[PDB]
Design a protein around this ligand. Structure first.
Ligand SMILES: [Mg+2]
Length: 281
């Protein structure tokens, strides 16, 4: 009620690095709010336009055994990997679709407590490791906040381990708006999932410990009203009353390869929009 529209126009795609090196890798990440729902809402139209080298999907609500046939309409992303909850049901779930097969694909974070909900794919390539995640939400009434804190610690420790061997790119729906600039209404959301001090602090801990840089915020440190999620309710997207929940976090060693980190605000299909990373690897 207190918010009207706030403008955001994502800047043009910067496709060369500081060294002048053209981008060699384009990664698109997207919380699809259910793979079938997303397909019905023309989600694949953006994927075809974007033509990424790697597509990471969160909240697929689908196991590798029950995938929709339409995913065959992406022949340029022929190597497809899927994780889903162990109970074999339609919730959570992540996907990674790639032009080239990774050297190795793994699922989860090496901890039984945290590996039952199909939340993480690890894809190792020659020069870097890619992780895509759908981080557990703290829940309505914060009923899952204690668990989320345990998740955060385990995930941080796991990523620090990976980064000790190869440069890391982490992408996906991290279910937190880091700072006040990362959501439209910080004042009214400090007791809500995604903007609790515990969640924000966890994100800060992750950046420091691994370490990782927030690609978007690194490039655009002072840019407001840049969001990746809007509630389906109450004209939130039309008013740009949103949250930045979706990130590409990078090892510091990859910052010289960083060309751009995009937010595809106008792309429909979900309550999140896609985000896209350009790297000159
Ligand atoms: Mg959803």
């Amino acid at each position: 009620a207190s918010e009207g529209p706030a403008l955001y126009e994502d800047p043009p795609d910067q496709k060369t690095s500081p060294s002048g090196k053209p981008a060699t890798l384009k990664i698109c990440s997207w919380n699809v709010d259910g793979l079938r729902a997303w397909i019905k809402k023309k989600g694949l139209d953006w994927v075809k336009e974007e033509a990424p080298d790697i597509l990471c999907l969160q909240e697929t609500k689908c196991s590798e055994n029950k995938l929709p046939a339409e995913l065959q309409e992406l022949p340029g992303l022929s190597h497809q990997y899927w994780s889903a909850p162990s109970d074999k049901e339609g919730y959570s779930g992540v996907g990674l679709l790639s032009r080239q097969a990774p050297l190795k694909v793994s699922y989860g974070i090496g901890d039984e407590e945290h590996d039952q909900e199909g939340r993480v794919i690890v894809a190792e390539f020659d020069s870097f490791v890619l992780v895509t995640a759908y981080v557990p939400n703290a829940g309505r009434g914060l009923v899952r906040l204690e668990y989320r804190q345990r998740w955060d610690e385990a995930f941080r420790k796991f990523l620090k381990g990976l980064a000790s061997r190869k440069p890391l790119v982490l992408c996906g729906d991290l279910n937190v708006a880091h700072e006040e600039i990362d959501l439209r209404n910080p004042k009214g959301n400090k007791k809500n999932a995604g903007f609790t001090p515990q969640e924000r602090q966890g994100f800060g801990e992750l950046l420091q410990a691994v370490p990782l840089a927030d690609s978007f915020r690194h490039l655009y440190p002072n840019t407001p009203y840049a969001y990746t999620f809007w509630t389906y309710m109450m004209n939130a997207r039309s008013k740009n009353v949103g949250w930045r929940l979706d990130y590409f976090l990078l090892s510091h060693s990859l910052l010289p390869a960083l060309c751009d980190s995009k937010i595809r605000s106008k792309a429909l299909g979900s309550d999140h929009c896609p985000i896209t990373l350009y790297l000159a690897l």
